Amino acid sequence: FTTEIHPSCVTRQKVIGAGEFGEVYKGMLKEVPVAIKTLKAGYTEKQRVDFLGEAGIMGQFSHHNIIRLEGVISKYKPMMIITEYMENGALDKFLREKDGEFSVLQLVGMLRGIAAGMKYLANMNYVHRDLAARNILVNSNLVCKVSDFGLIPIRWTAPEAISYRKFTSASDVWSFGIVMWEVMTYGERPYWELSNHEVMKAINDGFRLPTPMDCPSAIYQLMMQCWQQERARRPKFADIVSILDKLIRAPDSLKTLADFDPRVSIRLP
Numbered sequence: 001f002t003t004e005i006h007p008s009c010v011t012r013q014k015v016i017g018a019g020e021f022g023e024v025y026k027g028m029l030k031e032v033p034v035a036i037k038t039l040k041a042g043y044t045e046k047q048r049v050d051f052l053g054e055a056g057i058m059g060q061f062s063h064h065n066i067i068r069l070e071g072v073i074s075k076y077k078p079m080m081i082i083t084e085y086m087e088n089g090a091l092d093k094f095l096r097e098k099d100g101e102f103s104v105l106q107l108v109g110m111l112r113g114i115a116a117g118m119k120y121l122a123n124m125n126y127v128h129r130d131l132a133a134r135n136i137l138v139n140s141n142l143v144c145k146v147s148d149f150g151l152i153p154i155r156w157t158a159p160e161a162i163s164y165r166k167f168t169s170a171s172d173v174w175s176f177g178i179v180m181w182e183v184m185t186y187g188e189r190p191y192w193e194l195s196n197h198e199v200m201k202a203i204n205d206g207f208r209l210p211t212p213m214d215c216p217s218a219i220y221q222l223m224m225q226c227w228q229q230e231r232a233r234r235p236k237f238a239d240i241v242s243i244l245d246k247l248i249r250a251p252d253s254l255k256t257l258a259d260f261d262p263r264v265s266i267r268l269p
């Protein structure tokens with residue numbers, strides 16, 4: 001499912017990150033901008049299998065809300081995975097740098113796109129395992145594209161996946177609930193300064209993240225149901241996409257806001 005790109009058509013420019021056994025670059029493809037993940041010499045057999053395997057599944061995906069593979073360099077060294085370049089970068093940093101700049105409808109549209117990509121991934125029989133705003137890319141139309149840059153994300157991970165390594169679409173739904181909270185808070189840290197062990201204890205004791213400020217009641221209800229302890233009680237991604245699409249198409253439904261519990265009280269006359 002992957003197109004082979006000749007190395008002379010690819011120019012690496014700046015390093016933008018690191019991979020398992022290589023760097024990640026911004027570059028140009030003959031010139032459309034691209035992101036480039038390389039596998040550097042001395043890579044192991046396992047690393048090659050993982051690297052080309054990643055390319056293989058990526059080339060299979062054709063969806064508006066999944067990062068698009070442009071091609072691969074497998075016949076030459078260094079080997080490369082080349083994707084579209086998303087100019088606004090990762091969602092979490094994007095929202096932290098643009099705090100309060102979007103409408104409720106725009107934010108819920110982001111979540112609908114993320115949910116649509118996850119519905120596709122799950123129905124293609126893939127589990128993400130690390131769904132978080134840091135793994136979602138934003139383009140110049142505000143379209144969110146599910147991605148995976150590699151890593152322990154305790155705060156995003158469902159209880160059963162932490163406790164006995166059961167990673168499924170349903171534990172991805174838990175993570176999606178956390179991503180909903182990330183988006184509606186413009187990138188706040190889930191559970192703030194609580195330690196990983198304190199987060200697990202609070203969840204086991206039934207506590208859950210409070211409502212964001214200015215959050216539609218419907219949206220908080222949906223993220224709450226993503227965090228049900230009983231995995232079978234969580235919505236499927238099809239349910240999430242359906243609800244988000246109904247709220248967006250009847251946008252007055254988003255004007256009713258969940259109560260925000262103040263953490264500070266200002267007494268003035």
Ligand SMILES: Cc1ccc(C(=O)Nc2ccc(CN3CCN(C)CC3)c(C(F)(F)F)c2)cc1Nc1nc(-c2cccnc2)nc2c1cnn2C
Pocket residue numbers: 016017018019024034035036037054057058061066067081082083084085086087089090121126127128129137146147148149
């Ligand atoms: C080049 C490149 C290669 C690979 C990927 C990628 O998304 N891989 C991928 C692997 C697997 C899956 C599904 N599997 C998940 C795990 N499950 C167990 C099984 C299913 C998916 C899926 F489906 F979720 F989308 C995606 C992304 C890019 N491109 C970017 N990456 C970075 C970047 C920055 C810093 C550090 N690293 C990267 N910045 C970029 C771009 C583009 N623009 N910018 C600014």
